[PDB]
């Protein structure tokens, strides 16, 4: 009950973001984003067929696809260096080791390095819905607005331990706020809008046509 975001897995979104960035060309990129759009609406329909009158707000997902436009949540307070010490301990790898130093370096991006050491170690499924990921990102920003780095770590741990490595790859970019999709926000907005207006736009309905065009 309650929302679409509460029923769609975080994994679905990450699955899509992967297929987007991995593809060459604006065409295949749009196809994949549109797939997610279509999926979202399919969930909505299934909920209403099951008598749960949810809203189909895409915002829970849009806010993660375009994390650098996030303005409801405040700053995460998660410096990219804080992340390294957490992963070192989470699987208890030795400091100044092969994988330990790679994450302790700086600049593809940090997320691609974390994924490189997470893929063979798993602790995966994952489990989180999008709403729950959002709920945890909310708590991180709140813990940071209140100057509680300890609570940031705990909240952060909760996402990690419950996320697959692919899932973790994308969280990190959502936190750092650079997705690197290879498709602009302008087109994302267009596809999103065009998707809606192709559906919810009066074309041949005479009663609605006559009233509106006056």
UniProtKB/Swiss-Prot annotation:
Keywords: ATP-binding, Cell cycle, Cell division, Disease variant, DNA damage, DNA recombination, DNA repair, Ligase, Magnesium, Metal-binding, Nucleotide-binding, Nucleus, Repeat, SCID. Testis, thymus, prostate and heart. GO terms for cellular component: chromosome, telomeric region; condensed chromosome; DNA ligase IV complex; DNA-dependent protein kinase-DNA ligase 4 complex; intracellular membrane-bounded organelle; nonhomologous end joining complex; nucleoplasm; nucleus. Disulfide bonds: none annotated. It is found in: Nucleus. The keyword Membrane does not apply. One of its GO terms (molecular function) is DNA ligase activity. GO terms for biological process: base-excision repair; cell division; cell population proliferation; cellular response to ionizing radiation; cellular response to lithium ion; central nervous system development; chromosome organization; DN2 thymocyte differentiation. DNA ligase involved in DNA non-homologous end joining (NHEJ); required for double-strand break (DSB) repair and V(D)J recombination. Catalyzes the NHEJ ligation step of the broken DNA during DSB repair by resealing the DNA breaks after the gap filling is completed. Joins single-strand breaks in a double-stranded polydeoxynucleotide in an ATP-dependent reaction. LIG4 is mechanistically flexible: it can ligate nicks as well as compatible DNA overhangs alone, while in the presence of XRCC4, it can ligate ends with 2-nucleotides (nt) microhomology and 1-nt gaps. It is linked to LIG4 syndrome: Characterized by immunodeficiency and developmental and growth delay. Patients display unusual facial features, microcephaly, growth and/or developmental delay, pancytopenia, and various skin abnormalities. Interacts with XRCC4; the LIG4-XRCC4 subcomplex has a 1:2 stoichiometry and XRCC4 is required for LIG4 stability. Component of the core long-range non-homologous end joining (NHEJ) complex (also named DNA-PK complex) composed of PRKDC, LIG4, XRCC4, XRCC6/Ku70, XRCC5/Ku86 and NHEJ1/XLF. Additional component of the NHEJ complex includes PAXX. Following autophosphorylation, PRKDC dissociates from DNA, leading to formation of the short-range NHEJ complex, composed of LIG4, XRCC4, XRCC6/Ku70, XRCC5/Ku86 and NHEJ1/XLF. Interacts with DCLRE1C; the interaction is direct. Interacts with APLF. Belongs to the ATP-dependent DNA ligase family. This is DNA ligase 4. It comes from Homo sapiens. The gene is LIG4. The chain holds residues 7 to 229 of 911 of the full protein.
């Amino acid at each position: 009950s309650q929302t679409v975001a509460s029923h769609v897995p975080f994994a679905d979104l990450c699955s899509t973001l992967e297929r987007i960035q991995k593809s060459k060309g604006r065409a295949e990129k749009i196809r994949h984003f549109r797939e997610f759009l279509d999926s979202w609406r399919k969930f909505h329909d299934a909920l209403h067929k099951n008598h749960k009158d949810v809203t189909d707000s895409f915002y829970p997902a849009m806010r993660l696809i375009l994390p650098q436009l996030e303005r409801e949540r405040m700053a995460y307070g998660i410096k990219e260096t804080m992340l390294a010490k957490l992963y070192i301990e989470l699987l208890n790898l030795p400091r100044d080791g092969k994988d330990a130093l790679k994450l302790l370096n700086y600049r593809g991006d940090f997320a691609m390095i974390a994924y490189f050491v997470l893929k063979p170690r798993c602790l995966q499924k994952g489990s989180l819905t999008i709403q729950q990921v959002n709920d945890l990102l909310d708590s991180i920003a709140s813990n940071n607005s209140a100057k509680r780095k300890d609570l940031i770590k705990k909240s952060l741990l909760q996402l990690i331990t419950q996320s697959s490595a692919l899932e973790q790859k994308w969280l990190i970019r959502m936190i750092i706020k650079d997705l690197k999709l290879g498709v602009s926000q302008q087109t994302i907005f267009s596809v999103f809008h065009n998707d809606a207006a192709e559906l919810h736009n009066v074309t041949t309905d005479l009663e609605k046509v006559c009233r509106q065009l006056h």
